[PDB]
Each structure stands twice: as structure tokens, then as C-alpha cells.
């Protein structure tokens, strides 16, 4: 499917393959850097993005630990495993 990434007011549609994480999709497109990050291991909390539209499974306890001091709609890109149900979801970087 595909999701919409929004960086600097500019919308960019990206295609994703089932079971790919938003982190993988985002970083492999140059929209998000994987430098100094745990490389999508949900341990550094640097892959922050904002879920603004679409269906995305609620965050688990471990991820929530990293979003306590973040905006209400913040999520860890690597904590989100993309599947058909996420087709059309929009995220703001
Ligand atoms: S890449 Fe480290 S928490 Fe997502």
C-alpha cells in the first residue's frame, strides 16, 4: 500500500510493502535519518513522527514509554509495522 509523509509542509506519497516498518520506509526514502538511532529497535526513541490520519494500531507499553514527553500524536516510526490496514495513513515529520 502507500502512506503520506509530510515534511516541511510538503506532502510526499510513499509506497510500502507488507510488514515493513514506517522507519524503514521513511529512512530508506531520505525523509528520516537512521544515524545515531538504534536502527528501528525501539530503544533509542529518535524515530519520532506524528500520526495525523488513517488507521494505525495503538502504541504498546514499551513505545508509550518514549512518548510520555512527546506530543499527543507522537509515535515511534519503527514501532509501526505497515500492512494493508495502514494504506492511506498520513504521518508528519
Ligand atoms: S530507531 Fe530507535 S526507537 Fe526507533
From Swiss-Prot:
Domain 2Fe-2S ferredoxin-type: 1-93
Disulfide bonds: none
A family per Pfam: Fer2
Superkingdom of source: Eukaryota
PROSITE patterns for this protein: 2FE2S_FER_2 (PS51085)
Cofactor(s) listed: [2Fe-2S] cluster
CDD domains membership: fer2
Keywords annotated in UniProt: 2Fe-2S, Electron transport, Hydrogenosome, Iron, Iron-sulfur, Metal-binding, Transport
Molecular-function GO terms, alphabetical: 2 iron, 2 sulfur cluster binding; metal ion binding
Compartment(s): Hydrogenosome
Cofactor comment: Binds 1 [2Fe-2S] cluster.
Binding site for [2Fe-2S] cluster: 38, 44, 47, 78
SUPFAM superfamilies found in the cross-reference section: 2Fe-2S ferredoxin-like (SSF54292)
Gene Ontology CC, one term: hydrogenosome
Described function: Ferredoxins are iron-sulfur proteins that transfer electrons in a wide variety of metabolic reactions. It links pyruvate:ferredoxin oxidoreductase to hydrogenase.
Additional record remark: The propeptide may play a role in the targeting of this protein to the organelle.
Protein name: Ferredoxin
Amino acid at each position: 500500500g502507500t502512506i503520506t509523509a509530510v515534511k516541511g509542509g510538503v506532502k510526499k506519497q510513499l509506497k510500502f510493502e507488507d510488514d515493513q516498518t514506517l522507519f524503514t520506509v521513511l529512512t530508506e526514502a531520505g525523509l528520516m535519518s537512521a544515524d545515531d538511532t538504534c536502527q528501528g529497535n525501539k530503544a533509542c526513541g529518535k524515530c519520532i513522527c506524528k500520526h495525523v490520519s488513517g488507521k494505525v494500531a495503538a502504541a504498546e507499553d514499551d513505545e508509550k514509554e518514549f512518548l510520555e514527553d512527546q506530543p499527543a500524536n507522537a509515535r515511534l516510526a519503527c514501532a509501526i509495522t505497515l500492512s494493508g490496514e495502514n494504506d492511506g495513513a498520513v504521518f508528519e515529520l
